Amino acid sequence: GPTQRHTYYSECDEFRFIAPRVLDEDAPPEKRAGVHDGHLKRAPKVYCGGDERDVLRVGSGGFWPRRSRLWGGVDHAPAGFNPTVTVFHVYDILENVEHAYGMRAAQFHARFMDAITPTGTVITLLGLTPEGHRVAVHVYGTRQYFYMNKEEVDRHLQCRAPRDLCERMAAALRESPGASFRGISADHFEAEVVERTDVYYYETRPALFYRVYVRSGRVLSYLCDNFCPAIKKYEGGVDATTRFILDNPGFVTFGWYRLKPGRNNTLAQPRAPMAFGTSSDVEFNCTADNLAIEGGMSDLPAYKLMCFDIECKAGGEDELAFPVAGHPEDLVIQISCLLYDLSTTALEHVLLFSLGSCDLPESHLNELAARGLPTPVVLEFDSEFEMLLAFMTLVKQYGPEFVTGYNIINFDWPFLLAKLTDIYKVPLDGYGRMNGRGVFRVWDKIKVNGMVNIDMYGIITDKIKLSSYKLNAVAEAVLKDKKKDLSYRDIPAYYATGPAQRGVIGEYCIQDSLLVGQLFFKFLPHLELSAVARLAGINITRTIYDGQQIRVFTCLLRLADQKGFILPDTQVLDPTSGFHVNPVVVFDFASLYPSIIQAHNLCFSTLSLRADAVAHLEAGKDYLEIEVGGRRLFFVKAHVRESLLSILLRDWLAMRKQIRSRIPQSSPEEAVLLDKQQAAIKVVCNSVYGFTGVQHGLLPCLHVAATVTTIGREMLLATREYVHARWAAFEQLLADFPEAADMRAPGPYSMRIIYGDTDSIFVLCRGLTAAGLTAMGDKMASHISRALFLPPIKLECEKTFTKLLLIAKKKYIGVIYGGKMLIKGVDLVRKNNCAFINRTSRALVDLLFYDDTVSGAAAALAERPAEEWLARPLPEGLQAFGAVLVDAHRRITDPERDIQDFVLTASIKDRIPYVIVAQKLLVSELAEDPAYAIAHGVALNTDYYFSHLLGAACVTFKALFGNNAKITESLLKRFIPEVWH
């Protein structure tokens, strides 16, 4: 009997039986709606072919593939099976507490038991061997630690003598009635004095601190919140995995390893099957010295990818209601489950789980064989519970270390777990890799121990930009592929028809995962993630869910301690609105914030609020010097003290550039892995800025973020300053850039910056062609960059606007020389508005951009304040703009056969099309079915539709009149007769 219990189900004799009554064919006309919801006493069953079987049996003729040694008490390994392990790969790491007493009957060598006596944290390395064998290697020995000021503590209690301290902490822990679990001993702690320095400030001098080790995070946590009343505490937030990686040089979170002898030729101990803590084929106890990095050896082992996607159906009153997991009537009816070799890429298994009989189409089956793909295996069931258990039984038994699909984090996994926990009261702590007590939860964002979930939806929202992110949509843009035959509203209808129509549902389900697969092996996300994990020193599962600061803290921590630091704990030239007929050039700085940090030596360690005790070294040379926020600040440079961030980033930039110089002289396969790394360094570098300015995150320092803000500003003001001085005349520009020869346009020449924002400047170029300006702009930026700023800082050129409506602040419309329209901080469309108001509103903005007469006339408006155009007539070039509004009025009034164009719709609801019609004096009580209007020759409501077009035009083209909506309203009125106002 396992020394630690298996909490997943290896038997159920009874359970909650829920199934749609349609499934009954012994079925009167009336008894076929809704759902059965009762208790049934019998084992859960699977059907596959004419065959059946208990869902929880392992042995003979099992319907689905397993990778499982132990199944609730029985060892299913071949009598003989005893492989030896040397090298093995690691994809995931767990932290758990083990207690010596609970493990007595496990057959563990005393060095291990020693490590967990009252208690101890065990770090379990998860992965597999070259042969495919599933491994869990249990690292004993790692303790978490944290620091506290010696003399400060030594005074406020009182006792240098390191045992006195430990006793006082053990005595602190008794008094909390929160499970001291009789850990009221001075021996559950070691406390050593070391010299060190709080990272903050230039002045701060090395003090003496107590390093104190602890046996469990449980303990550490309490002492954070309680032992430190006034006393300052350092690196208490640092988990055991991260101590295990950082204190063992070279060690990684994702890599190959080998076990070897240690200190006194100590050897890793294989575990007896009955003390396995996970579902792996082999397990071992060891300490860090029994482990070594196995560099050179690099190839991904045969780990598996499960790719699934679920389909549901609504019960209750209205079967076209979107399904809700909390409803017992609203059932998961099918799950598409695909199993790949992740090292190979091959699709090994196609499984479809199905509530009710399901007969896949012959056509879909022909298409699978024809593509050299596995024949699907259809598992069918009478109830939702039987099918959910089956799926979860497969999730435990096959144990895909990797899992994927589309929106599975947002819809699929939440739906299925809501059902498992709430409706069926099944516990999940045992269904991951651990046999019990493991994490298996979704939040608002899922965490399943020993399972790396990568959701393709988010990956795709991260590489490609689109109008839509639906799969069939995504499948047509990215895989250039076309399939379009399903809608959640059709499911019920089809479900009720019979087993063939359920097959169709199953087809589109399998095909859905097929496409998601094809995408995962297109974008190889796990490899972007491994690389970050591998680089940041963190578990792969935290490279996705856990955000920003995590990826950077760890590295900051390693460096910080090298240096002998400790980390404390939780304790007016922007736009003048107007239109532009001359080209506008857009300069951007590349990774501005990180390049500032590095160039200007900015760190926790190098800043100060004091002028004194600053080595009194000297201003200018040794000092940065800034009027930051409230007051004056100072930052030392890389000769006096070099910044910890600075170092992180420089090292990462030198790494990227040395990796990038290699991409072309390596193999195709070597280049695919260097690209992922080269991109990983970029994900991590773009993080360091953010890391600084989280006011309640780990190591904030708002006075670095804010100095970077104010340096960002100065730099672009300098770029402004420069361009105006240097390029005021075309002659100097021709001397720097001889190709300007063929760029001189008719006008007078003038180069002026018009918009400044975060990291980009807009430069209006009179007398120049839009034609070669993007290429000349690179050079300009290169030139500027090489002339004004310190390395990494790099200004570049993206983009020339042939024409530009500069509305405001962060709001503009432009056509891009050589491209499309770009619209920022506005839309010219509304899903809610009728076609006609949208099409015309749009036609207007196109006249302004694409009609050269309207474009000059629009430009000329800028030569004159809004109010002065009220006095005088608008420039004639706008005749065509007015022709469009006039024209729209006529579109409405006339017996004009397209009423459809004026239809509004604001399930049952919206969908009812209507139109607003002419005539107490009524208020949109003049809705009407369209057909009725037509059939009765009813006029549309001129005043209504037109005033909506006038309003929309008015908000889009205020810019031509300094954003005064009033003046705009008045001037566009001149283009239409007053009797139509």
From Swiss-Prot:
Record-linked PANTHER family: DNA POLYMERASE CATALYTIC SUBUNIT, DNA POLYMERASE DELTA CATALYTIC SUBUNIT
SMART domains, per the entry: POLBc
Subcellular location: Host nucleus
UniProt GO cellular component terms: host cell nucleus
Superkingdom to which the source organism belongs: Viruses
Annotated catalysed reactions: DNA(n) + a 2'-deoxyribonucleoside 5'-triphosphate = DNA(n+1) + diphosphate; Endonucleolytic cleavage to 5'-phosphomonoester
Family matches, as InterPro entries: DNA-dir_DNA_pol_B (IPR006172), DNA-dir_DNA_pol_B_CS (IPR017964), DNA-dir_DNA_pol_B_exonuc (IPR006133), DNA-dir_DNA_pol_B_multi_dom (IPR006134), DNA/RNA_pol_sf (IPR043502), DNA_pol_B_thumb (IPR042087), DNA_pol_palm_dom_sf (IPR023211), DNA_pol_type-B (IPR050240)
Function: Replicates viral genomic DNA. The replication complex is composed of six viral proteins: the DNA polymerase, processivity factor, primase, primase-associated factor, helicase, and ssDNA-binding protein. Additionally, the polymerase contains an intrinsic ribonuclease H (RNase H) activity that specifically degrades RNA/DNA heteroduplexes or duplex DNA substrates in the 5' to 3' direction. Therefore, it can catalyze the excision of the RNA primers that initiate the synthesis of Okazaki fragments at a replication fork during viral DNA replication.
The family this protein is said to belong to: Belongs to the DNA polymerase type-B family.
Keywords on record: DNA replication, DNA-binding, DNA-directed DNA polymerase, Endonuclease, Host nucleus, Hydrolase, Multifunctional enzyme, Nuclease, Nucleotidyltransferase, Transferase, Viral DNA replication
A Pfam family of this chain: DNA_pol_B
Gene Ontology molecular functions: DNA binding; DNA-directed DNA polymerase activity; nucleotide binding; RNA-DNA hybrid ribonuclease activity
Organism: Human herpesvirus 1 (strain KOS) (HHV-1)
KW Transferase (keyword) present: yes
Protein name as catalogued: DNA polymerase catalytic subunit
GO biological process, one term: viral DNA genome replication
Chief location bin: host cell
Oligomer status and interactors: Forms a complex with the ssDNA-binding protein UL29, the DNA polymerase processivity factor, and the alkaline exonuclease. Interacts with the putative helicase-primase complex subunit UL8; this interaction may coordinate leading and lagging strand DNA synthesis at the replication fork.
Record bears the keyword DNA-binding: yes
